[PDB]
Amino acid sequence: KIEEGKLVIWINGDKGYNGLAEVGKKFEKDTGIKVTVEHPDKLEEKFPQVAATGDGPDIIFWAHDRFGGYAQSGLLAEITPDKAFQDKLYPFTWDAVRYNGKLIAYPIAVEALSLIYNKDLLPNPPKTWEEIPALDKELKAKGKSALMFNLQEPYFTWPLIAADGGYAFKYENGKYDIKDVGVDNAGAKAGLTFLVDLIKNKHMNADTDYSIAEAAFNKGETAMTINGPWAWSNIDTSKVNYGVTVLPTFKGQPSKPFVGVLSAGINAASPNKELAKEFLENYLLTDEGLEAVNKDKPLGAVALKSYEEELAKDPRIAATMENAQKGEIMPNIPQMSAFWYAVRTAVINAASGRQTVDEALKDAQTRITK
Ligand SMILES: O=C[C@H](O)[C@@H](O)[C@H](O[C@H]1O[C@H](CO)[C@@H](O[C@H]2O[C@H](CO)[C@@H](O[C@H]3O[C@H](CO)[C@@H](O)[C@H](O)[C@H]3O)[C@H](O)[C@H]2O)[C@H](O)[C@H]1O)[C@H](O)CO
């Protein structure tokens, strides 16, 4: 069982756990309640294990898409923020933490892919996907290329694919309609076709992955790349003069990158649920709390309006939220796994010539709504 009278918190080792510990120190100063932050290896794999036996931390931090699985096994307690507190956060973030109509976690940070560009090679980045082919041609005559990004993960290619109307699962009836999938529609076919053509016309290479694209941009060889806030650190170290902006539009429609919300859930087996609520709502989710964590390790964009408004003073952060609001919250339902694998395959096959674009998406669609 979990010990009563204190709070044990789990957050990944790449996050600002030292800053989080300081908020916990503040909590102890004001309430006398001790807080312990830990960052065990593969914590998101261990949580389901220990939580199933009534053990584990009182609070766990992780991207919201993993919380669907946890809530499915009843591992997270339903949270009770009132209307007033909910209005302190951007409305769309609350949707990322709702399962069977119930709120099961507190939104902390918000992330989404953005268009990253080299200001020295490209002071005026393209506002549309359509003008990249021509831009690539003129940059080649200069010894450089226009764009390079990870094409191995559907998470990275979806922004373009979904731009003109694509979606994973329709969300209206309170939750997701698992039979209403948008990977087979005209918009997706159009998006995936433009993507495949960029490869066929040699503006991109079907084999490019995360490391290949990162190295290219951080060396100054390609003018643009598509990545998230987690990649800025490496770019900073490379000293390339870069900027972060809204993703290019396609067919006049904005790219729709998936959105991941770092969230804080409360262990269903915790005997300290009220303490957890007090800490999360009135200590962490305040300008002072997030500041303490952010100073340790940047959170990127955040769900708390007041603090995000301050952070948006950084154009890279402002662009991150801009792209997020034009994006699609990652579905937390069990069916999303089937979507990831089917779409990953469709892209690989359409780019290798194993299947035409239409046939690749047609099969992915059928496999998902299976
Ligand atoms: O520095 C931390 C940072 O989060 C990195 O870990 C970074 O994460 C980002 O990019 C991921 C994509 O590479 C995002 O993952 C989501 O999308 C993928 C789909 O591409 C999902 O993966 C699922 O599908 C694949 C098949 O393609 C399968 O192998 C996986 O098992 C299955 O889960 C993820 O589940 C989504 O979360 C992530 O949100 C984002 O932060 C990169 O991972 C660094 O390479």
Coordinates of all heavy atoms in Angstrom, one line a residue, residues 31 56 64 130 166 189 195 287:
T31 N 2.7 23.6 4.7 CA 1.8 22.6 5.3 C 2.5 21.6 6.2 O 1.8 20.9 6.9 CB 1.1 21.8 4.2 OG1 2.0 21.0 3.5 CG2 0.4 22.8 3.2
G56 N 2.8 2.2 -5.6 CA 3.3 3.2 -6.5 C 3.2 4.6 -6.0 O 3.0 4.8 -4.8
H64 N -0.4 12.7 -21.9 CA -1.7 12.2 -21.7 C -2.1 10.9 -22.5 O -3.0 10.2 -22.0 CB -2.7 13.3 -22.0 CG -2.8 13.5 -23.5 ND1 -3.8 12.8 -24.3 CD2 -2.1 14.2 -24.4 CE1 -3.6 13.2 -25.6 NE2 -2.6 14.0 -25.6
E130 N 3.1 23.8 -50.7 CA 3.2 23.9 -52.2 C 4.4 24.6 -52.7 O 4.9 24.2 -53.8 CB 1.9 24.6 -52.8 CG 0.7 23.7 -52.7 CD 0.0 23.8 -51.4 OE1 0.6 24.3 -50.4 OE2 -1.2 23.4 -51.3
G166 N -7.8 15.2 -42.7 CA -7.6 13.9 -42.1 C -7.7 14.0 -40.6 O -7.6 15.1 -40.0
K189 N -5.6 11.5 -48.7 CA -5.0 11.0 -49.9 C -4.3 12.2 -50.6 O -3.2 11.9 -51.1 CB -6.1 10.5 -50.9 CG -6.9 9.4 -50.4 CD -7.6 8.6 -51.5 CE -8.6 7.5 -51.0 NZ -9.9 8.1 -50.7
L195 N 3.2 14.4 -50.1 CA 4.3 13.9 -49.4 C 5.1 12.9 -50.3 O 6.4 13.1 -50.4 CB 3.9 13.1 -48.1 CG 5.0 12.5 -47.3 CD1 6.0 13.6 -46.8 CD2 4.5 11.7 -46.1
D287 N 2.0 30.4 -11.5 CA 3.2 31.0 -12.2 C 4.5 30.6 -11.5 O 5.5 30.4 -12.1 CB 3.1 32.5 -12.3 CG 1.9 33.0 -13.1 OD1 1.5 32.2 -14.0 OD2 1.4 34.1 -12.9

